[PDB]
Design an enzyme around this catalytic site. Structure first.
Site, PDB file in Angstrom:
ATOM      1  N   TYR B 509     -26.594 -23.633 -10.485  1.00  0.00           N
ATOM      2  CA  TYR B 509     -25.833 -24.857 -10.710  1.00  0.00           C
ATOM      3  C   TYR B 509     -26.694 -25.824 -11.515  1.00  0.00           C
ATOM      4  O   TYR B 509     -26.387 -26.114 -12.673  1.00  0.00           O
ATOM      5  CB  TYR B 509     -25.390 -25.504  -9.393  1.00  0.00           C
ATOM      6  N   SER B 592     -18.964 -24.696 -13.656  1.00  0.00           N
ATOM      7  CA  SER B 592     -19.100 -26.114 -14.001  1.00  0.00           C
ATOM      8  C   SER B 592     -20.492 -26.317 -14.610  1.00  0.00           C
ATOM      9  O   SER B 592     -20.841 -25.655 -15.593  1.00  0.00           O
ATOM     10  CB  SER B 592     -18.939 -26.980 -12.748  1.00  0.00           C
ATOM     11  N   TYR B 593     -21.290 -27.217 -14.031  1.00  0.00           N
ATOM     12  CA  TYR B 593     -22.617 -27.505 -14.578  1.00  0.00           C
ATOM     13  C   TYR B 593     -23.405 -26.207 -14.660  1.00  0.00           C
ATOM     14  O   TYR B 593     -24.188 -26.006 -15.579  1.00  0.00           O
ATOM     15  CB  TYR B 593     -23.378 -28.527 -13.723  1.00  0.00           C
ATOM     16  N   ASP B 670      -7.190 -26.943 -15.663  1.00  0.00           N
ATOM     17  CA  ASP B 670      -8.404 -27.639 -15.231  1.00  0.00           C
ATOM     18  C   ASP B 670      -8.408 -29.079 -15.759  1.00  0.00           C
ATOM     19  O   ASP B 670      -8.648 -29.315 -16.947  1.00  0.00           O
ATOM     20  CB  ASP B 670      -9.644 -26.879 -15.723  1.00  0.00           C
ATOM     21  N   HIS B 702      -9.929 -26.459 -11.589  1.00  0.00           N
ATOM     22  CA  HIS B 702     -11.373 -26.274 -11.685  1.00  0.00           C
ATOM     23  C   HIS B 702     -11.902 -25.300 -10.637  1.00  0.00           C
ATOM     24  O   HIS B 702     -12.980 -24.724 -10.800  1.00  0.00           O
ATOM     25  CB  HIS B 702     -12.078 -27.618 -11.542  1.00  0.00           C
TER      26      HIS B 702
END
Ligand SMILES: *[C@@H]1O[C@H](CO)[C@@H](O[C@@H]2O[C@H](CO)[C@@H](O)[C@H](O)[C@H]2NC(C)=O)[C@H](O)[C@H]1NC(C)=O
Ligand SMILES: *[C@@H]1O[C@H](CO)[C@@H](O[C@@H]2O[C@H](CO)[C@@H](O)[C@H](O)[C@H]2NC(C)=O)[C@H](O)[C@H]1NC(C)=O
Ligand SMILES: *[C@@H]1O[C@H](CO)[C@@H](O[C@@H]2O[C@H](CO)[C@@H](O)[C@H](O)[C@H]2NC(C)=O)[C@H](O)[C@H]1NC(C)=O
Ligand SMILES: *[C@@H]1O[C@H](CO)[C@@H](O[C@@H]2O[C@H](CO)[C@@H](O)[C@H](O)[C@H]2NC(C)=O)[C@H](O)[C@H]1NC(C)=O
Ligand SMILES: *[C@@H]1O[C@H](CO)[C@@H](O)[C@H](O)[C@H]1NC(C)=O
Ligand SMILES: *[C@@H]1O[C@H](CO)[C@@H](O)[C@H](O)[C@H]1NC(C)=O
Ligand SMILES: *[C@@H]1O[C@H](CO)[C@@H](O)[C@H](O)[C@H]1NC(C)=O
Ligand SMILES: *[C@@H]1O[C@H](CO)[C@@H](O)[C@H](O)[C@H]1NC(C)=O
Lengths: 208, 728, 728, 208
Positions: B509, B592-593, B670, B702
């Site tokens: 992450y 995500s990140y 998303d 998401h």
């Protein structure tokens, strides 16, 4: 002879922070005349009585009028530290004063209502240190320093205004925030009277 | 020769973790659901009485999505017809059932399509939001009072958050705060009038002939932000004769000069409220303390009671300024503050004094303040053994800061190193939740003696099941990069032989204040990858990670896409030279990140990584929302930090992808990390001649967490990973 | 041991086909571009003079996208700043250069963002469309006359088509028709007011922070259709003092009672115009013949001159009713009409007689009428050798229908069996274009003696190049299904040994009136698949295919997704039992309708096919546009044909995909077959647990034909095909 | 005595296909009076002259008036087979007739203009065979059979109207299409006069 209350009846009473001032020197007044046009909801005076303020003669009479909702009666007080006394309208404590809450009927038609009632709920300076907030309190017989940045009627409850200050003005910022109260069926107004008793110049007397 | 934890096992949830969720209703009683029955358990005795038969609503005519019992047991709120929106938002229908009358309330009902409902903290008042306006019921069967008349879809939000406040500030759909005994109801109003819309297609069922275009006010980095105003209404002065008077509390002048946010609302007493405001440039924040004026009926916020908090090395707080915890008299408060060494500790404040006093210190951090009494402050921290991925409950004596007791370190030190706590109404009792390294364990305790009453759930049934399967092991440890410990965890395949050479998956992450190395016990995809496919799944917390002080956390300040990316590569280097890692079989993946960092690593040209999977990645910071992005990056303008915005895109590195196999996955619906971001990645790779694997998930947000979609994506990632690793 | 035709060869266009494009400017002269110079060639002598030096605009200040020379040589229209929209639509800037003055016209210019411009057929009048309104210039340097004032983006279209008329009716962006000597300008007005919008995202460059939502009025099956009105304006009566008078010609009463279309506009004389209207239910159409009234200045359409055309077995015409070809006096006309046997032949009409007279007959079809004189009718057909995938030029004698001469069958019968023709202004000369089976050949001829003047382009350079490479071979043949020939073609790998067993790719379109089996020479992807990868690429024209009569073409009437799907399967069965086909390596792929059929086949559960690729497929007919879909399917209502709409979806068959490997590709900016269609396919496969391969192409339309994207998709399909076939 | 042209001057002249009819029996007319109000652009008569039609006495005078653009003069003719004679307005061929084109000035203000000029450009029946189209021609002294389906003003040039017919009405359909011409600065009108010479009843004479 006979005191000229004219421009009060013609137009839209401004907001409390833009209160209009009528000055009275050397004339006769029928005030119970004026207060017979309106429906009167509250009459309190300081260092005088409503009975007395009709009767006596003075060297100077000042009449301040503006739009003002009855719902906010607890904030229009000589003994109040609400936003009204802080940032909007302050009477002198050194002269006898009266405060009148009224309601224009229907019968009175030359008095127009505005979109809503507006008042200033914050007027402060942010110093050039970006940290220190100094409330700008209104002095008696003066307008708020924020009337330059607060519209004559506040567009929406809680709007806020800002204006950066020149280094000569002190630097930092000027900041304000406006509040609104919904307009009423019949327009509701506020009257502030201030009398001065002179030595020999008591040329503002009632009439008979 | 027992079985493995299979992909099927993970997707069908064959090996279940039990829980114990309770709701404290008093200082010594709580509610539990057992066989669909709601019971009340006495904390002392452990005796229980039935509060609600499961049969009660077996004649309701609807499926019941959620329920809420009034704080006085008289009423139950019944949520049905639920329809999801964002991470925390939705709409539904609600009924109210009288528990004494044992009847349904049929009149003056809460309207359909209601957006949020909440009980007062005592009694049975209701505040609800319908069509962006706030309504209050004093008595449940009587007409509601309309508080606001300005509500307007996608424009004016009264008592509910807009998209960005929901996701990046309050972590909640609600923007209502009842005073402790429910006399006052405080609320925010958001104005998205000038906030640009993100628009995207929603396809829905086959039968829908034309797709719908969803439109959401969403401020991307540098865009026009939503505006905010704050009000308090007296719910005891309500009447059907006049409209309610909402008293506004204005923000401090230091906020009004420019763009700002409302970041915290915390009641101190029955007539004192604290507000925290945060500047758009998020290294400056102010607490305002406001007292009710019983004469005027207004709220005065003394300038002398303001508390300025401001950062010189990054942003304020971990994600936002911390919430204050007030003493009963509201004249002083405890708050988590970063110290001169950059470590987050408990500070003690006087509401009219600028300077605060630290009551904790050390090279570890307080995670959260959990309870406060006249005698003791209760908090969670990672002090134990200097393990930042551990969590224990501590109590500190208010009269003597040296008298700190660890209430959890000693209970089960082998099985339990990750704790959360739930206190009863006066901290007379507390429930402890052990989340690992062993099977989760739920116990009950009394605060008076810190005596352990009993075990609520020990997960013996699962332990029993997991004996017949070859489960993987978890190593949690650290490495040293120029004089600094950096933690990692490895999920190790069963029968681990360190002389052999295993393929490695980096699970990443790596967002600011993230923590992927901890003592939590998990049954997930990595379990299957290790149990069945003999893959070492590793995570690493490098620069930017949290709970180890600001030197590490603020490292990536104004330069996302740099250090936290590098360290993931360096971690892979370190791992390979331990000797049990096949250096020709190192993959990497992230959501995500994590998807961002995964992509940034795959385009680093480091040759350390063979393949990789990005799920819903960020690709360039100006596509992401303002609150999150600007916290770490500032504004994307030449006067500020435009350079680092443009230097840190995935697209920039499109060329390097020729050396790696790449899987790009993204949901079409998303609203968080827009499909756009991946659309821009794939387009740059096409424009440069790189082949890659792609997969869209139509109508998935998401989370890509619908039942079918969740199985589908993991199955698909499995094939990709097995294929990159030449596995059967 | 020569080289192969590689994927690189196909994508880089290393082996170029030369062409010869000319523009007849008179009855014996034409323009050609040679070394960027425009030359005029005399047909007789073959001598040439330079018309325009390449240097002329080498000081223009812009790149020049296209040019158009006025029919009288006096002016040249210069198109720059071109920006594409749909298959035929765009906007640009235009300048006009005076060829006598040898100067640019600087005043009263054609505005930027002009949507269409066209010269009058004689002289140098201009009609252009800007902001949906029509403008006319009589003299190029003088102010324009505004014809229409009703133009409105996405609503009112004057002189240009809306989306559906452009794609499914006129195959063109323009809706302007000059009378032969440019006295009158006829035009259509379309009204998309109540037509629903298809909306989709466009992402554009990285630098665009928020995606744009494109909105296009687009009628899906059964939706509200656009409305149409028709006008004629006299361009010689124009004046700056009054607004122009557009005389409307109303549709016939048989059309006005319900939804209808304008389907054909053809001028007969200088004062006679023919219009064809088509009912929404497309098995009924009417020709209207309208004469100019020189007294009133209006147009009268005699009811006695109406010509009704109507089908009882399907729709009218191949895709639309055929265009009439009028005799010089406009009192009679030739038109392609299906006969009593269902074959399309030339019929001879009198403008006031109902009955027509066939001048051709046979079990073959006329493809098109190419030229008409007082003595001869010229047409293309597939009569030669009963090969429906062949094309030859014929001339028939008007005084004696038995006197038909084939003008192309004999010129080069080995090299050339696919011809198109370009006639000079009175059919005194014609250019012939051979498209296969050999290398394309371009020749010049005079009609008087049908003498061959000369060879324009013989493609010798390519023939020279292709000798050093192992090129594949093409078999074109047929099979017999219950007493009916069905044609197929096979692209055979070099050194073809029929004892070995090859993997087979079925290349499929199969839409109504399609033809994938012909004599055309091609250098495409299948060439590489055969040359380099030893794959037999096959196509098959089954039921629904065209140019072989209505029994075959109308077979799939009101039942798309049935016969044409089955026959593709049956074709694969037939192919495998020829003995040179590996029955464990049969793949299938198709674009658009081909993508639909490919998908329908992969979900047939026939087990004949191992893998398959669908590019921008239709997935369900109610997603596609009204004009095309309803032509074959009728309305999706219970009173009509809802059943066959619902029976023929791809999603329906999601389950069967478990037996096959599937690649689904679609462009995000496809305004034709919306991404939606694939979004619904993938969603149904997810919902049912089928794995598959997917790839979106961001910002690509139905063609996916940008340089980079085109290479990318073919490369990606190559890997997929090679991987399914266990190829190195 | 004195002919009543009143309702012409008050209101909006209808469209040609809704022409209003004024009948005149037993009165005196000053017509050169009426034509002195307007600006007159064209005056043609059939079987009479404009000079003659002012002078003579009649047993019956019919005045038909409507809005009508000067641009369409070539279509308002006794010798014309345009849409006007076909579907809108047809005079009798058996009586002497006159046709007047005029323009209301500004000076005339009680005459109001409509949104635009409208006329019928198609009026036909589609027989119950769905194939046969039969134009419905207007007969003299009558309205078009399509006035039941064509609005009093056409909304947009080229609009079309339809109405399915009852089996009693003949079956099939009724169909029409409307045309528009842009309104002018000064409103433009059309007047159609038809005179009948009686045997002894010539009670419509001029006045002196
Ligand atoms: C738990 O048990 C206790 C007694 O063991 C209950 O408390 C008493 O309930 C009795 C009824 O049997 C009352 O008459 C007493 O006055 C109660 N004493 C107390 C503690 O106030 C209690 O009700 C039980 N709690 C639950 C949740 O079942
Ligand atoms: C909750 O707190 C409020 C605020 O202090 C209490 O309301 C006050 O109660 C006192 C005593 O009755 C009054 O004198 C004040 O005027 C009240 N203030 C206001 C604003 O109402 C209230 O008593 C508490 N409510 C409950 C349920 O205990
Ligand atoms: C092609 O060549 C012919 C002559 O061979 C040209 O026609 C003649 O051009 C001459 C000038 O040399 C004129 O004086 C004659 O009057 C022309 N005769 C004809 C045929 O009318 C012709 O101009 C050439 N065409 C091109 C395109 O270059
Ligand atoms: C193009 O055709 C038109 C239509 O026939 C021709 O215009 C007519 O020409 C004749 C002879 O001059 C006139 O008597 C008619 O009144 C014209 N009709 C119209 C509507 O204009 C015209 O001559 C031809 N144009 C060219 C360039 O030859
Ligand atoms: C409700 O409680 C009873 C108690 O015996 C239990 O047997 C039953 O299964 C429960 N019903 C549901 C719906 O869980
Ligand atoms: C909510 O919607 C349902 C379904 O239409 C309806 O029956 C019911 O009356 C609604 N409830 C309320 C509170 O209006
Ligand atoms: C233009 O024509 C000349 C003729 O010799 C040729 O050499 C040159 O290459 C041409 N220029 C361009 C731009 O093609
Ligand atoms: C077209 O646009 C260009 C670029 O802005 C401008 O210079 C030019 O004047 C425009 N042309 C016309 C015909 O207005």
């Amino acid at each position: 002879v006979e005191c000229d209350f004219s421009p009060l009846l013609s137009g839209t009473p401004p907001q409390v922070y833009n209160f209009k001032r009528l000055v009275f020197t050397n004339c006769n007044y029928n005030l119970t005349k004026l207060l017979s046009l309106f429906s009167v909801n509250d009459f309190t005076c300081s260092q005088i009585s409503p009975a007395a303020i009709a009767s006596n003669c003075y060297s100077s009479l000042i009449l301040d009028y503006f739009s003002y909702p009855l719902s906010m009666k607890s904030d229009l007080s000589v003994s109040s530290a609400g936003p009204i006394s802080q940032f909007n309208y302050k009477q002198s404590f050194s002269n006898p004063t009266c405060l009148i809450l009224a309601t224009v009927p229907h019968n009175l038609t030359t008095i127009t209502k505005p979109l809503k009632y507006s008042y200033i709920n914050k007027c402060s300076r942010l110093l050039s240190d970006d940290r220190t907030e100094v409330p700008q309190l209104v002095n008696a017989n003066q307008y708020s320093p924020c009337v330059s940045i607060v519209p004559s009627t506040v567009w929406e409850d809680g709007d806020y205004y800002r204006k950066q200050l020149s280094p000569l003005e002190g630097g930092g910022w000027l900041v304000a925030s406006g509040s609104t109260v919904a307009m009423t069926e019949q327009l509701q107004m506020g009257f502030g009277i201030t009398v001065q008793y002179g030595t020999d110049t008591n040329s503002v007397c009632p009439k008979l | 020769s027992r079985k493995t934890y299979t992909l099927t096992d993970y997707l069908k949830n064959t090996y279940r973790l039990k829980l114990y969720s309770l709701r404290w209703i008093s200082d010594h009683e709580y509610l539990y659901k057992q066989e669909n029955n709601i019971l009340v358990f006495n904390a002392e005795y452990g005796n229980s009485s039935v509060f609600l038969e499961n049969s009660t609503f077996d004649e309701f005519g609807h499926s019941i999505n959620d329920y809420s019992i009034s704080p006085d047991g008289q009423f139950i709120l019944l949520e049905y017809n639920y329809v999801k929106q964002w991470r925390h938002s939705y709409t539904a229908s609600y009924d109210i059932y009288d528990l004494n009358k044992r009847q349904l309330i049929t009149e003056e009902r809460i309207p359909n399509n209601t957006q949020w409902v909440t009980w007062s903290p005592v009694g049975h008042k209701l505040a609800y939001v319908w069509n962006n306006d706030i309504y209050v019921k004093i008595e449940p069967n009587l007409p509601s009072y309309r508080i606001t008349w300005t509500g307007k879809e996608d424009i004016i939000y009264n008592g509910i958050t807009d998209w960005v406040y929901e996701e990046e500030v309050f972590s909640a759909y609600s923007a209502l705060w009842w005073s402790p005994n429910g006399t006052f109801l405080a609320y925010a109003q958001f104005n998205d009038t000038e906030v640009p819309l993100i628009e995207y297609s929603f396809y829905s069922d086959e039968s829908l002939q034309y797709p719908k275009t969803v439109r959401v006010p969403y401020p991307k980095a540098g865009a026009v932000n939503p505006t905010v105003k704050f009000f308090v209404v007296n719910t005891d002065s309500l009447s059907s004769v006049t409209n309610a008077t909402s008293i506004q509390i204005t923000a401090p002048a230091s906020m009004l000069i420019g763009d700002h946010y409302l970041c915290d609302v915390t009641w101190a007493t029955q007539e004192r409220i604290s507000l925290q405001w945060l500047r758009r440039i998020q290294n400056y924040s102010v607490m305002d303390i406001c007292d009710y004026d019983e004469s005027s009926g207004r709220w005065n916020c003394l300038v002398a009671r303001q508390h300025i908090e401001m950062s010189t090395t990054g942003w304020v707080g971990r994600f936002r300024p911390s919430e204050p915890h007030f003493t009963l008299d509201g004249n002083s408060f405890y708050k988590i503050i970063s110290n001169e060494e950059g470590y987050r500790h408990i500070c003690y404040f006087q509401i009219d004094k600028k300077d605060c006093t630290f009551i904790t210190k050390g090279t570890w951090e307080v995670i959260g303040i959990e309870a406060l009494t006249s005698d003791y402050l209760y908090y969670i921290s990672n002090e134990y053994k200097g393990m930042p991925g551990g969590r224990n409950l501590y109590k500190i004596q208010l009269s003597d800061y040296t008298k700190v007791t660890c209430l959890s370190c000693e209970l089960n030190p082998e099985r339990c190193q990750y704790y959360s706590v739930s206190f009863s109404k006066e901290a007379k009792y507390y429930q402890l939740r052990c989340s690992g390294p062993g099977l989760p364990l739920y116990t009950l305790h009394s605060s008076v003696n810190d005596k352990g009453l009993r075990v609520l759930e020990d997960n013996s049934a699962l332990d029993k099941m997991l004996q017949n399967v070859q489960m993987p092991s978890k190593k949690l440890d650290f490495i040293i990069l120029n004089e600094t410990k950096f933690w990692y965890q490895m999920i190790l395949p069963p029968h681990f032989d360190k002389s052999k050479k295993y393929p490695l998956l980096l699970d990443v992450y790596a967002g600011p204040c993230s923590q992927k190395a901890d003592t939590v016990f998990r049954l997930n995809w990595a379990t299957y990858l290790a149990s069945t496919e003999n893959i070492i799944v590793a995570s690493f917390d490098g620069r930017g990670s949290g709970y180890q002080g600001d030197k590490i956390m603020h490292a990536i300040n104004r330069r996302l896409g740099t250090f936290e990316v590098e360290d993931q590569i360096e971690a892979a280097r370190q791992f390979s030279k331990m000797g049990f890692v096949d250096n020709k079989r190192i993959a990497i993946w992230g959501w995500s990140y994590g998807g961002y960092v995964t992509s940034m690593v795959l385009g680093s040209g480091s040759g350390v990584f063979k393949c990789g999977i990005a799920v819903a990645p960020v690709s360039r910071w100006e596509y992401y929302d303002s609150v999150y992005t600007e916290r770490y990056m500032g504004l994307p303008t030449p006067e500020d930090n435009l350079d680092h915005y443009r230097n840190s895109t995935v697209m920039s590195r499109a060329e390097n992808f020729k050396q790696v196999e790449y899987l790009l996955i993204h949901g079409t619906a998303d609203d968080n990390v827009h499909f756009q971001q991946s659309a821009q990645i794939s387009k740059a790779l096409v424009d440069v001649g790189v082949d890659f694997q792609a997969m869209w998930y139509t109508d998935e947000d998401h989370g890509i967490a619908s039942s079918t979609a969740h199985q589908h994506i993991y199955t698909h990632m499995s094939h990709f990973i097995k294929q990159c690793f030449s596995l059967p």
